[PDB]
Amino acid sequence: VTSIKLVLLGEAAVGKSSIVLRFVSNDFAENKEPTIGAAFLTQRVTINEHTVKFEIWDTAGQERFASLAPMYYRNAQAALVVYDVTKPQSFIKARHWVKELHEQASKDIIIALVGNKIDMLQEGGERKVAREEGEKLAEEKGLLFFETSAKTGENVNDVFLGIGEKIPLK
Numbered sequence: 001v002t003s004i005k006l007v008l009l010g011e012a013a014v015g016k017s018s019i020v021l022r023f024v025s026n027d028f029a030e031n032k033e034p035t036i037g038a039a040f041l042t043q044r045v046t047i048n049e050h051t052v053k054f055e056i057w058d059t060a061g062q063e064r065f066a067s068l069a070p071m072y073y074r075n076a077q078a079a080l081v082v083y084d085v086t087k088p089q090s091f092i093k094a095r096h097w098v099k100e101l102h103e104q105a106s107k108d109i110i111i112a113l114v115g116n117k118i119d120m121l122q123e124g125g126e127r128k129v130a131r132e133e134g135e136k137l138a139e140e141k142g143l144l145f146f147e148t149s150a151k152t153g154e155n156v157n158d159v160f161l162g163i164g165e166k167i168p169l170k
């Protein structure tokens with residue numbers, strides 16, 4: 001068993017808590033309420049005979065909680081920087097989160113850039129962050145890159161496995 005300290009960061013309402021609920025409980029709530037400060041969750045994944053245990057701090061993305069974020073990313077081994085593919089503002093905030101982690105988090109943190117809510121693009125939804133622009137930011141800044149839907153589950157497990165496949169196991 002190998003534990004991995006992970007933090008989620010990103011603008012309010014991009015779906016951080018929904019990504020974690022999908023990963024931990026395989027559930028989705030259209031009425032998920034804003035997180036208060038942060039929430040802790042765990043989930044285990046199997047890689048061959050290894051158990052990889054994620055210790056997850058799901059931070060609140062509202063500015064009223066912004067000064068709590070450093071305590072949760074301070075000793076994180078992995079971060080998910082989440083934006084909403086239908087909200088270009090949230091991608092500007094993702095860019096700022098990547099620079100803050102490069103300045104202030106551990107020098108050996110692994111970062112995944114995650115564009116969420118892609119299910120919305122198959123209904124009444126506008127893609128306002130091209131996948132290629134997410135990929136470009138990830139390539140330039142040395143991040144993993146995924147697009148996800150917490151609502152359908154699409155690629156959510158792939159995000160967490162992609163991180164666990166890059167950290168040495170016990």
Ligand SMILES: Nc1nc2c(ncn2[C@@H]2O[C@H](COP(=O)(O)OP(=O)(O)NP(=O)(O)O)[C@@H](O)[C@H]2O)c(=O)[nH]1
Binds near residue numbers: 017149
């Ligand atoms: N269609 C769709 N809705 C989603 C998706 N992920 C989250 N949502 C919805 O978006 C809203 C905000 O989700 P939530 O997980 O609370 O986001 P958050 O980033 O944790 N907000 P906070 O930072 O304030 O805690 C909710 O209504 C939720 O159901 C997704 O992939 N698709």
Ligand SMILES: Nc1nc2c(ncn2[C@@H]2O[C@H](COP(=O)(O)OP(=O)(O)O)[C@@H](O)[C@H]2O)c(=O)[nH]1
Binds near residue numbers: 048168169
């Ligand atoms: N990322 C990662 N993959 C691992 C690790 N240990 C095993 N694996 C995966 O498990 C596959 C098979 O593992 P191996 O130890 O060769 O076990 P075997 O195939 O059962 O005899 C490896 O090829 C990897 O894909 C590990 O520490 N990290």
Ligand SMILES: [Mg+2]
Binds near residue numbers: 017
């Ligand atoms: Mg939340």
Ligand code: NI
Binds near residue numbers: 050169
């Ligand atoms: Ni092994």
